[PDB]
C-alpha cells in the first residue's frame, strides 16, 4: 500500500520517519527515511513509502536520529490499501482544511524540441495547472531546473480526483494517453517516450537523477 507522512516539525529542518514492527523496517535502517519540506506549507515534511498492509507499524518521528526523537506512535495500515496521515502535536488521517491535492507530473523530453505542452482532462472544476482547462496543444510547461531533459506540470485540486493528460510538443510528436491516479495529497509521477512506448514511473527512474 502507499503510504504518505506529512509532519509540522518541532525539532528543526532536518527531520526523518523511521518506520517499523518487530524486525522489519520499511523506512530502512535508523533514522529511517528523510522527510522533505513540504511544499505549500512552511514548517511541514513529507515522506512517501511502500509497504506490506499484512501489519500495523510503529512510527518514531526524529531529527535525523540525532538528539530528539518523538514517542512512538502506531500506524493503522494493516489492510488498507492506501493512508495520509498528519502529526501535528498528535497523529491524525483527517486533511486540515487550507491543504489542496498537489500533483505533480514529469516528462522526459526527447528528440522533440524544447517547447513541450500538457493537454489534460478530467479533473475537478477546482483545478489549477498549465493545462486547465485549454484546448489542444494544452498549456506550455517548463523545463525541470535541476534535472536535464526533464519538464514538469503541477496539477492542484480541492478534492482528490484522478485525471488524464497527454505531453506534446504541438509538432507531431505526442505521448500515448497517462491515466493519473491521485494517491495523496502530494501524488508524483514521472513519465518517458512517446506514442507507442510510453512508461509511468510510480518511483523516480534511473534516468531521472
Do not use: R
Amino acid at each position: 500500500m502507499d503510504l504518505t507522512i506529512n509532519y509540522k516539525s518541532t525539532l528543526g529542518d532536518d527531520v526523518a520517519a523511521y518506520i517499523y514492527k518487530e524486525t522489519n523496517k520499511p523506512a530502512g535502517e535508523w533514522p529511517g527515511k528523510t522527510m522533505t519540506a513540504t511544499a505549500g506549507h512552511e514548517g511541514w515534511y513529507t515522506m512517501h513509502l511502500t509497504l506490506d498492509n499484512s501489519t500495523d507499524y510503529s512510527l518514531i518521528l526524529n531529527d535525523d536520529g540525532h538528539g530528539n526523537q518523538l514517542k512512538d506512535v502506531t500506524l493503522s495500515t494493516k489492510g488498507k490499501a492506501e493512508a495520509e496521515y498528519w502529526f501535528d502535536g498528535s497523529l491524525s488521517e483527517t486533511k486540515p482544511a487550507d491543504w489542496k491535492y498537489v500533483t505533480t507530473i514529469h516528462y522526459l523530453a526527447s528528440g522533440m524540441g524544447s517547447t513541450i505542452y500538457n493537454y489534460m482532462w478530467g479533473a475537478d472544476a477546482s483545478a489549477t495547472g498549465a493545462g486547465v482547462g485549454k484546448e489542444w496543444p494544452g498549456g506550455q510547461i517548463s523545463a525541470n531546473a535541476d534535472h536535464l531533459g526533464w519538464y514538469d506540470v503541477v496539477y492542484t485540486q480541492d478534492v482528490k480526483q484522478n485525471f488524464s493528460c497527454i505531453f506534446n510538443n504541438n509538432n507531431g510528436t505526442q505521448t500515448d494517453n497517462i491515466d493519473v491516479s491521485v494517491t495523496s495529497t502530494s501524488t508524483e509521477l514521472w513519465v518517458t517516450g512517446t506514442k507507442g512506448d510510453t512508461t509511468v514511473y510510480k518511483t523516480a527512474p534511473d534516468s531521472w537523477e
